[PDB]
């Protein structure tokens, strides 16, 4: 944008930091992938490295904190890592790292946050129920205004060893890190006593990097376009792309395929006691498949707490796979096998990833794909497009294909006894 | 509306004519209904009565004209009635009835219209392809600015004896007849040479009777609210409700059930070589069923010319019938059995009705339920609401239930050999 080649459409300044993105996964204890020719760093080790390198600041947006066995009233070896994480966190403030933690208003005092407060970290509880009827569901870390983690892993030891998670760590990308810090600051401001959402956020929260003018970055030595989308709409300044709009733009721009892996997919306002039908994403997928022959693959997690009403809706989508329409939509259920010893571990053994990948773009989110997460509840997503054929997009596609062809993915007609865990959708 | 009880919302003048509505059906030769405790007058006899009583004027909006065996290159007794109809039509102008006939631009000279032109009737061909990319699909009669027929029957002898049709004749309702004449006049104006759709139609085309302020009429001695909706949008003045909006208002207002019988149902722009997904009606039905527990019954016709791609979409809707959601959507295929002697009759033996009925309202249309009919192609619908529990609404519900429970309606898993006719959807 030069004001003479494009007029008032000034393209914002490019970023010259040597950004590098790493996919990070939590693979629960017991899951093996025969082929998986490559593996990604675990969430635990990425988090520990970030904490070890931290020297100035750490901001965490979080849903809940259960990093210790005491938190879950259990006694499991596999909890170590969360505890280790907690330990390292408590070492940040004493050595001079400014720590700020925004957490959804809990239903009672939390041990980890009290210990971190005693260590010198700042903690604020955000009551999103009173503001938007949603919750602070976002999970991300910003380190030294230079690195950040965005993904599905909660501040939960299970998230490291007993729950499958996917996310991304962006290193040496200070521009994007500061951009994410703007969202964090929205949370931080709302975490005070008596604060309300402004009708128009101050300019310090606004951003020039969005769907229309994404940030130009050097990702792994190659040019790429990236931006961060936010939810809910009342928390988005005018320049910040809403999460739903970013997701649907990725869906509508796909010309070859759309692979989606999300723990829950529901074309409804799950909540809102007067229930509401919510076909935004569903209609986007139907549109892609019908109009542009896009092959749609939907990998939905299933465990004992899954909403059974999901099944019908998924079946509805699956019904569009037809010879005459040339529409190609397939649905599979990803189940995490459980042992009798793992069955005592409360609320674990489920695939928690929330991401989508096409032939042109990558979308990594914190939200499940139901209406509330995009209208009332807090969430963030990273969107990256890179003109090459390798890169982070290819890594995401490989992860999805590995999970899709793995024996843990089953069709909707599969028997409930052949999946290795409780599945209300089968 | 009194300007002091409701402000600028002035309710238009009520109609004091003794309006009486009669459901009229074409039941093809060979279809019998064991119970059907009541029967409706045939389309042929209603049309013949209207022609016999006509003394001042007749306006016909039409799609095509094949009223004679010569037109279809056949020799069938069951054609008589169309021919009889044609005969009576030719008697109108010689005895002083002003006849105006608007017809979609045909692909060659039409015999019936040439004969009627020689009889003294005015005929105009409307080229909707050049104006909106659609066709003049509307079928209705206005008689003496007092009566009118609105329904699915074309100016085709088959429509009387070999194709199932549903429609309504409104007698002694001059207010509504003149209102319909306004739509006809839109067609008549566009039927000239070199005319184009005005950006704003002159006031003579506008109407005060619409969804917001329906006409108050005395229907069969009881108060009722009625209005006429029109398609496509470019042909609607500001006061005229578009057909799609009227249909969707009936769908969204239903609290108990929605019964729909339409020859074709497709959530797509069937046409528009770059194909388009079109979920307006589909989403409305999903919304009704999910949010308000409305029981949805979809009776779709199936014959040798049916679009096979319908099946998948219907199955998609049918997939929402689930115990957990409490959603109740059912789909059946209505097939007209054919004989070897009827098989020579070209383009016949199919259910042609286009109507919807709820527990509160009646909708009778000229259009199949696909996108083009509501965006580019000409169509009209009559909407009636009556606070009582009998009336025209109950008659429509009885007709639908008769057709639904009849042996001619089959589920989507039925074998193609058990329906009595070619069915591409089975
Ligand atoms: C953009 O740039 C960034 C930055 O340059 C780049 O990020 C790198 O991405 C690559 C590819 O994904 C990463 O390399 C992979 O790392 C995987 C994880 O390695 C870590 O974890 C290993 C597992 O440790 C646990 O389990 C073992 C079990 O045996 C146990 O002992 C441990 O205690 C622990 O519990 C760990 O072994 C590993 O440490 C070894 O490897 C590192 C290499 O970084 C080395 O420095 C160490 O000294 C040590 O030797 C590390 O801690 C890893 O699994 C994976 O291995 C795959 O390939 C091999 C070879 O074929 C297979 O045999 C194997 O089965 C796996 O399939 C691979 O090495 C790399 O770590 C990232 N770098 C950073 C800083 O994160 C992006 O990829 C770039 N993007 C693009 C598009 O190019
Ligand atoms: C609002 O007001 C309007 C106006 O008042 C009102 O409209 C009336 O609605 C009623 C109910 O729908 C109509 O009455 C029905 O009419 C049916 C059709 O009747 C016509 O067609 C008959 C069939 O003729 C063909 O087939 C026979 C086969 O045997 C053949 O001979 C013929 O040649 C032809 O091919 C025909 O027989 C009939 O003529 C008889 O009946 C009329 C009555 O109008 C009488 O005047 C004649 O002299 C002659 O006797 C007529 O031409 C009819 O099928 C139906 O019958 C049902 O009920 C009987 C009794 O139970 C059953 O035995 C039978 O099997 C059927 O189930 C019934 O009679 C009436 O015609 C409408 N009036 C007008 C002017 O259209 C609305 O209903 C009102 N709305 C509300 C909500 O109240
Ligand atoms: C979970 O809760 C239990 C029970 O409250 C905690 O147990 C505590 O564990 C610590 C060490 O893990 C014990 O402290 C130890 O004291 C000895 C005394 O000499 C000292 O030498 C050691 O170096 C260590 O500091 C502590 O006594 C013990 N408390 C009880 C009541 O048994 C446990 O620490 C909690 N875990 C987490 C992660 O919070
Ligand atoms: C369909 O096409 C055929 C062939 O063109 C038409 O046949 C015509 O039928 C009419 C009567 O139905 C015949 O007219 C008759 O002429 C005698 C002559 O004395 C007269 O006495 C009768 O009263 C009657 O008017 C006409 O000759 C005949 N033409 C041919 C070539 O056989 C038929 O009329 C067409 N049907 C329709 C509905 O248009
Ligand atoms: C991010 O930036 C740091 C600092 O420049 C990089 O750390 C260097 O890494 C190379 C290769 O591993 C070493 O040879 C240098 O000695 C490191 N420098 C310092 C100051 O530590 C780091 O590699 C970059 N990328 C990531 C993913 O951290
Ligand atoms: C519509 O109006 C006409 C004219 O008022 C009605 O015709 C009358 O019908 C009654 C009962 O059938 C007869 O007793 C009268 O002699 C008729 N009058 C005339 C002038 O014909 C007619 O019934 C009304 N309804 C319909 C459906 O036509």
Coordinates of C-alpha atoms in Angstrom, one line a residue, chain B residues 98-327:
Chain B
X98 CA -61.3 -9.1 -22.2
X99 CA -58.7 -11.8 -22.1
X100 CA -55.0 -11.2 -21.4
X101 CA -52.5 -14.1 -21.3
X102 CA -48.9 -13.7 -20.1
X103 CA -46.7 -16.7 -21.0
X104 CA -43.0 -17.5 -20.6
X105 CA -41.2 -17.0 -23.9
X106 CA -41.7 -20.4 -25.6
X107 CA -39.2 -22.2 -27.8
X108 CA -41.4 -22.0 -30.9
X109 CA -44.9 -21.0 -31.9
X110 CA -47.7 -22.3 -29.6
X111 CA -50.9 -23.6 -31.2
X112 CA -53.3 -22.8 -28.3
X113 CA -52.1 -19.2 -28.0
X114 CA -52.4 -18.6 -31.8
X115 CA -56.0 -19.9 -31.7
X116 CA -56.8 -17.7 -28.7
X117 CA -55.3 -14.7 -30.5
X118 CA -57.6 -15.4 -33.4
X119 CA -60.5 -15.6 -31.0
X120 CA -59.6 -12.1 -29.8
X121 CA -57.6 -12.7 -26.6
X122 CA -54.4 -10.7 -26.0
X123 CA -51.2 -12.7 -25.6
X124 CA -47.8 -11.5 -24.5
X125 CA -44.6 -13.5 -24.2
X126 CA -42.4 -12.6 -21.3
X127 CA -38.6 -13.2 -21.7
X128 CA -37.6 -13.5 -18.1
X129 CA -34.3 -15.1 -19.2
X130 CA -33.1 -11.8 -20.6
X131 CA -34.3 -9.8 -17.5
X132 CA -33.5 -12.0 -14.5
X133 CA -32.1 -15.3 -15.9
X134 CA -35.4 -16.9 -14.8
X135 CA -38.6 -17.9 -16.4
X136 CA -42.3 -17.0 -16.0
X137 CA -43.2 -20.0 -13.9
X138 CA -46.3 -18.5 -12.3
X139 CA -49.7 -20.1 -12.8
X140 CA -52.8 -18.1 -11.8
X141 CA -56.1 -16.9 -13.1
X142 CA -57.9 -13.6 -12.2
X143 CA -61.6 -13.6 -13.2
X144 CA -63.6 -10.3 -13.4
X145 CA -61.3 -8.8 -10.8
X146 CA -63.4 -10.9 -8.3
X147 CA -62.2 -14.5 -8.4
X148 CA -58.8 -16.0 -8.7
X149 CA -57.1 -19.4 -9.0
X150 CA -53.6 -19.9 -7.6
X151 CA -51.9 -23.3 -7.7
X152 CA -49.6 -25.7 -9.4
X153 CA -51.8 -26.6 -12.4
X154 CA -50.3 -25.5 -15.7
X155 CA -52.3 -24.7 -18.9
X156 CA -51.8 -28.4 -19.8
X157 CA -54.3 -31.1 -20.3
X158 CA -52.1 -33.5 -18.4
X159 CA -52.3 -31.2 -15.4
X160 CA -56.0 -32.1 -15.3
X161 CA -56.0 -35.9 -15.7
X162 CA -52.5 -37.3 -15.6
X163 CA -50.6 -35.0 -13.2
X164 CA -51.5 -34.5 -9.5
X165 CA -52.1 -30.8 -8.8
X166 CA -53.2 -28.7 -5.8
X167 CA -54.4 -25.1 -5.8
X168 CA -57.0 -22.7 -4.4
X169 CA -59.9 -20.8 -6.0
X170 CA -60.9 -17.7 -4.1
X171 CA -64.4 -16.5 -5.0
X172 CA -66.1 -13.2 -4.3
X173 CA -62.9 -11.6 -2.9
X174 CA -62.5 -8.6 -5.2
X175 CA -59.9 -6.9 -2.9
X176 CA -57.5 -9.8 -3.1
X177 CA -58.3 -10.4 -6.8
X178 CA -57.2 -6.8 -7.6
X179 CA -54.1 -7.2 -5.5
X180 CA -53.1 -10.3 -7.6
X181 CA -53.9 -8.3 -10.7
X182 CA -51.1 -6.0 -9.7
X183 CA -48.6 -8.9 -10.0
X184 CA -50.2 -9.8 -13.3
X185 CA -49.6 -6.2 -14.5
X186 CA -46.0 -6.5 -13.7
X187 CA -45.9 -9.5 -16.0
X188 CA -48.0 -7.7 -18.6
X189 CA -45.7 -4.7 -18.7
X190 CA -42.6 -6.8 -19.0
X191 CA -44.2 -8.7 -21.9
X192 CA -43.8 -5.8 -24.3
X193 CA -40.9 -5.3 -26.7
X194 CA -37.9 -3.4 -25.2
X195 CA -39.3 -3.1 -21.7
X196 CA -37.0 -3.4 -18.7
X197 CA -37.5 -3.8 -15.0
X198 CA -37.8 -0.4 -13.4
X199 CA -35.5 0.2 -10.4
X200 CA -38.7 1.4 -8.6
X201 CA -42.0 0.2 -9.8
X202 CA -44.8 2.9 -10.2
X203 CA -47.2 3.2 -7.3
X204 CA -49.9 1.4 -9.3
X205 CA -48.0 -1.8 -8.7
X206 CA -47.4 -1.3 -5.0
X207 CA -49.6 -2.9 -2.3
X208 CA -50.4 -2.2 1.4
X209 CA -51.2 -5.9 2.0
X210 CA -48.2 -7.9 3.1
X211 CA -46.6 -9.9 5.9
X212 CA -46.5 -6.8 8.2
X213 CA -50.1 -5.7 7.5
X214 CA -52.0 -8.6 5.9
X215 CA -55.4 -7.9 4.4
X216 CA -58.3 -8.5 6.8
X217 CA -61.0 -10.5 5.0
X218 CA -64.1 -12.4 5.8
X219 CA -63.3 -15.9 4.6
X220 CA -66.2 -18.4 4.7
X221 CA -68.0 -16.1 7.2
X222 CA -65.0 -16.0 9.6
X223 CA -62.3 -13.3 10.0
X224 CA -58.9 -14.2 8.4
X225 CA -55.7 -12.5 7.4
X226 CA -54.4 -13.1 3.9
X227 CA -51.8 -11.8 1.5
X228 CA -50.0 -12.6 -1.7
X229 CA -46.2 -12.9 -2.0
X230 CA -44.3 -12.5 -5.3
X231 CA -41.0 -13.5 -6.8
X232 CA -38.4 -12.6 -8.0
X233 CA -37.3 -9.7 -5.8
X234 CA -36.8 -7.3 -8.7
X235 CA -40.5 -7.7 -9.5
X236 CA -41.6 -6.8 -6.0
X237 CA -42.5 -3.2 -5.1
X238 CA -41.5 -2.1 -1.6
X239 CA -44.9 -3.1 -0.1
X240 CA -45.0 -6.6 -1.7
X241 CA -43.7 -9.4 0.4
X242 CA -41.1 -11.6 -1.4
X243 CA -42.2 -15.2 -1.8
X244 CA -39.1 -16.5 0.2
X245 CA -39.8 -14.2 3.1
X246 CA -43.4 -15.3 3.3
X247 CA -42.5 -18.9 3.2
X248 CA -39.8 -18.5 5.8
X249 CA -42.1 -16.5 8.1
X250 CA -44.6 -19.4 8.0
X251 CA -41.7 -21.8 8.8
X252 CA -40.4 -19.7 11.7
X253 CA -43.8 -19.0 13.1
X254 CA -44.8 -22.7 13.4
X255 CA -44.9 -24.1 16.9
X256 CA -46.4 -27.5 16.4
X257 CA -45.8 -29.0 12.9
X258 CA -44.8 -28.1 9.4
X259 CA -46.1 -30.3 6.5
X260 CA -44.6 -29.6 3.1
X261 CA -45.6 -31.2 -0.2
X262 CA -43.5 -30.0 -3.2
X263 CA -42.5 -31.8 -6.4
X264 CA -38.8 -30.8 -6.1
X265 CA -36.9 -29.7 -3.0
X266 CA -33.3 -28.7 -3.5
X267 CA -31.1 -26.5 -1.1
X268 CA -29.2 -25.3 -4.2
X269 CA -29.3 -23.0 -7.1
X270 CA -30.2 -25.9 -9.4
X271 CA -29.1 -23.7 -12.3
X272 CA -26.3 -21.0 -12.4
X273 CA -23.7 -23.2 -14.1
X274 CA -21.3 -22.0 -11.4
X275 CA -23.3 -23.9 -8.8
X276 CA -24.4 -22.3 -5.5
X277 CA -25.4 -23.9 -2.2
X278 CA -28.7 -22.4 -1.0
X279 CA -29.7 -23.4 2.6
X280 CA -32.4 -20.7 3.3
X281 CA -35.3 -23.1 3.5
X282 CA -33.2 -26.0 4.7
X283 CA -31.8 -23.9 7.6
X284 CA -35.3 -22.7 8.4
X285 CA -36.6 -26.3 8.7
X286 CA -33.6 -27.3 10.8
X287 CA -34.2 -24.3 13.0
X288 CA -37.8 -25.1 13.5
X289 CA -37.2 -28.8 14.4
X290 CA -34.3 -28.1 16.7
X291 CA -35.2 -24.9 18.5
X292 CA -39.0 -25.4 18.8
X293 CA -39.5 -29.1 18.6
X294 CA -41.6 -28.7 15.4
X295 CA -42.4 -32.0 13.7
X296 CA -41.4 -31.6 10.0
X297 CA -42.9 -33.8 7.3
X298 CA -41.4 -33.5 3.8
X299 CA -43.3 -35.2 1.0
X300 CA -41.2 -34.9 -2.2
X301 CA -42.3 -36.2 -5.6
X302 CA -40.2 -38.7 -7.5
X303 CA -40.4 -39.7 -11.2
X304 CA -38.1 -40.5 -14.0
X305 CA -37.0 -36.9 -14.4
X306 CA -36.2 -36.2 -10.8
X307 CA -32.8 -34.8 -9.9
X308 CA -30.9 -37.7 -8.2
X309 CA -28.8 -35.2 -6.2
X310 CA -32.0 -34.6 -4.2
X311 CA -31.6 -37.9 -2.3
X312 CA -28.4 -36.9 -0.4
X313 CA -29.9 -33.6 0.7
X314 CA -33.1 -35.2 1.8
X315 CA -31.2 -37.8 3.7
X316 CA -29.2 -35.1 5.3
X317 CA -32.4 -33.6 6.7
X318 CA -33.7 -37.0 7.7
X319 CA -30.5 -37.6 9.6
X320 CA -31.6 -35.0 12.2
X321 CA -34.4 -37.3 13.5
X322 CA -32.8 -38.2 16.8
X323 CA -33.8 -39.1 20.4
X324 CA -31.3 -36.8 22.1
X325 CA -32.0 -33.7 20.1
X326 CA -35.8 -34.4 20.3
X327 CA -35.8 -33.3 16.7

